[PDB]
């Protein structure tokens, strides 16, 4: 007992998924009663509570993380009544994930002059889990029709407005929107009803 113990060296983060980052380290001061405690927290906001975990090996797999999120990691060694201060901090940002929220605040308005033309306006989804690459607008004269029967209107790029031309006058029309990121298409919005003049 010649207190205190040397904190871990060579702390490294390895990105595995949208929710998994693998932490490895080195223990120069090396079967006995000792154990490591891994701590992690989201880089932003500045003040956040740390999550902890015990590990007997010189590795720990941090699970259940937020997608497209940057985390701070540290390790410490605990042996009996002795302990090491926290190690050097390692950083890792989880992979992206398909959006898991639909585009929000969807609105449909007729184009000034041209009534067979409508302007769809929306907002990005909350749970976007990555950079929005684009959107897909679906529309029908039957809200009950299967998604494949609906008219497909791709919206290339992260624009929040789109124009649809050549539609039937004085007709109820229904509108759904879904978002896109590198990992695929996220959910669709609830159908919004708009009757043409
Ligand atoms: O001297 S005693 O055997 O009575 O135990 C007290 C402390 O010895 C240390 C080092 O201090 S010193 O020997 O008094 O100078 O043990 C730590 O280092 C040696 C090997 O390194 S050395 O400096 O080249 O001698 C290891 O073996 S041993 O001499 O203790 O038998 C230790 O490995 S072990 O984990 O104890 O099995 C090593 O301890 S540790 O990895 O740091 O926990 C003190 O530790 S130190 O000051 O942090 O380096 C010993 O305290 S202890 O709690 O009894 O281990
Ligand atoms: C680690 O185990 C120690 C007992 O060995 C306990 O005090 C501590 O709360 C455990 N931590 C976690 C997060 O499992
Ligand atoms: Na993306």
Curated annotation (Swiss-Prot):
Domain Fibronectin type-III, first and last residues per copy: 7-100, 102-197
Subcellular location: Cell membrane
Expression sites by tissue: Widely expressed.
Glycosylation site positions: 54
Function: Multi-functional cell surface receptor regulating cell adhesion in many diverse developmental processes, including neural tube and mammary gland formation, myogenesis and angiogenesis. Receptor for members of the BMP, netrin, and repulsive guidance molecule (RGM) families. Netrin-Neogenin interactions result in a chemoattractive axon guidance response and cell-cell adhesion, the interaction between NEO1/Neogenin and RGMa and RGMb induces a chemorepulsive response.
Domain notes: The Fibronectin repeats 5 and 6 mediate interaction with RGM family molecules.
Subunit structure: Interacts with BMP2, BMP4, BMP6, and BMP7. Interacts with RGMA and RGMB. Interacts with MYO10.
Family affiliation: Belongs to the immunoglobulin superfamily. DCC family.
Protein name (Swiss-Prot/TrEMBL): Neogenin
Gene it is expressed from: Neo1
């Amino acid at each position: 007992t010649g207190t205190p113990m040397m904190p871990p060296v060579g702390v490294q983060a390895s990105i595995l998924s949208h929710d998994t980052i693998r932490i490895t380290w080195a223990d120069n001061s090396l079967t006995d009663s000792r154990y490591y405690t891994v701590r992690w927290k989201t880089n932003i906001p500045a003040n956040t509570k740390y999550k902890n975990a015990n590990a007997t090996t010189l590795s720990y797999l941090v699970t259940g993380l937020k997608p497209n999120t940057l985390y701070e990691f540290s390790v410490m060694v605990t042996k009996g009544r002795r302990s090491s201060t926290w190690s050097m901090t390692a950083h890792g940002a989880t992979f992206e994930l398909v959006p898991t929220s639909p585009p929000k605040d969807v609105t449909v308005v007729s184009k000034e002059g041209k009534p067979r033309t409508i302007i769809v306006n929306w907002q990005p989804p909350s749970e976007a889990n990555g950079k929005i690459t684009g959107y897909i607008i679906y529309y029908s004269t039957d809200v009950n029709a299967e998604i494949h029967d609906w008219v497909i209107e791709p919206v290339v790029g992260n624009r929040l407005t789109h124009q649809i031309q050549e539609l039937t006058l004085d007709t109820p029309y229904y509108f759904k929107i879904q978002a896109r990121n590198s990992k695929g298409m996220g959910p669709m919005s609830e159908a919004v009803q708009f009757r043409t003049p």
